[PDB]
């Protein structure tokens, strides 16, 4: 007999930028009809209304960025993971909801709806534009339509309560401004244009009811 035994040893492969068969491939085919709108965004969304709405900058303040990290990492191992069970910071989550549209293979708004958005934002009759930005909003694509949608849906809510997180619809307009369009670093290089753009976005969510909520004109 006699027989004893020494254990096992192996080394751990390499390690990329990052490693999954879904950054490669387009939201329209990570997501199903049944659902287009990530789960990902959705439970950093649902999570933070949950967990209050009032946590001081959501998105201007982050904090730590390690929380982020196992965010993503533990959600890609596991899509079943509770972010709950983890009990993270508020602001760590808001972060890593963002991180997941930058990561995007393309912009949230296509380019064939660049001059669309701003030609509907400078327009003189308040309600006009609106509709415009209501119409035009129809175009966006089929996958992302529903996501800026529901991502909007939130923001507001958090413009509502800028007396806490001292953030409204023009501050997360901004803050998000980054990811929503990232354009080159010289934008001058041409003619430059009022700062229009900004005032797009804000809108769209001061007014993301009146859409199709039709909530009275706020203001």
Same mark, same amino acid.
């Given at each position: 007999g006699s027989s004893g035994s020494s254990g096992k040893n192996f080394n751990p492969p390499t390690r990329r930028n990052w490693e999954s068969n879904y950054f490669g491939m387009p939201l329209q085919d990570l997501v199903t009809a049944e659902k287009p709108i990530p789960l990902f965004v959705e439970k950093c969304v649902e999570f933070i209304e949950d967990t209050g709405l009032c946590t001081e900058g959501l998105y201007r303040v982050s904090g730590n960025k390690t929380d982020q990290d196992n965010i993503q990492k533990q959600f890609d191992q596991d899509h079943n993971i509770n972010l709950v069970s983890m009990?993270?910071?508020?602001?760590?989550?808001?972060?890593?909801?963002?991180? &997941?549209?930058?990561?995007?293979?393309?912009?949230?708004?296509?380019?064939?709806? !660049?001059?669309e958005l *701003?030609?509907? %934002?400078?327009?003189?009759?308040?309600?006009?534009?609106?509709?415009?930005?209501?119409?035009?909003?129809?175009?966006?694509?089929?996958?992302?339509?529903?996501? &800026?949608?529901?991502?909007?849906?939130?923001?507001?809510?958090?413009?509502?309560? !800028?007396?806490?997180? *001292?953030?409204? %619809?023009?501050?997360?307009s901004i803050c998000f401004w980054p990811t929503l369009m990232r354009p080159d670093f010289e934008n001058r290089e041409f003619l430059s244009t009022t700062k229009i753009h900004q005032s797009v976005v804000e809108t769209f969510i001061q007014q993301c009811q009146f859409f199709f909520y039709n909530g009275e004109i706020v203001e």
């Open positions: 009990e993270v910071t508020v602001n760590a989550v808001a972060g890593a909801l963002k991180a &997941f549209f930058a990561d995007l293979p393309d912009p949230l708004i296509p380019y064939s709806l !660049h001059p *701003l030609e509907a %934002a400078k327009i003189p009759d308040k309600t006009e534009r609106l509709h415009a930005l209501k119409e035009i909003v129809k175009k966006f694509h089929p996958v992302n339509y529903d996501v &800026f949608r529901y991502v909007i849906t939130h923001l507001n809510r958090v413009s509502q309560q !800028h007396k806490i997180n *001292l953030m409204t %619809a023009d501050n997360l």
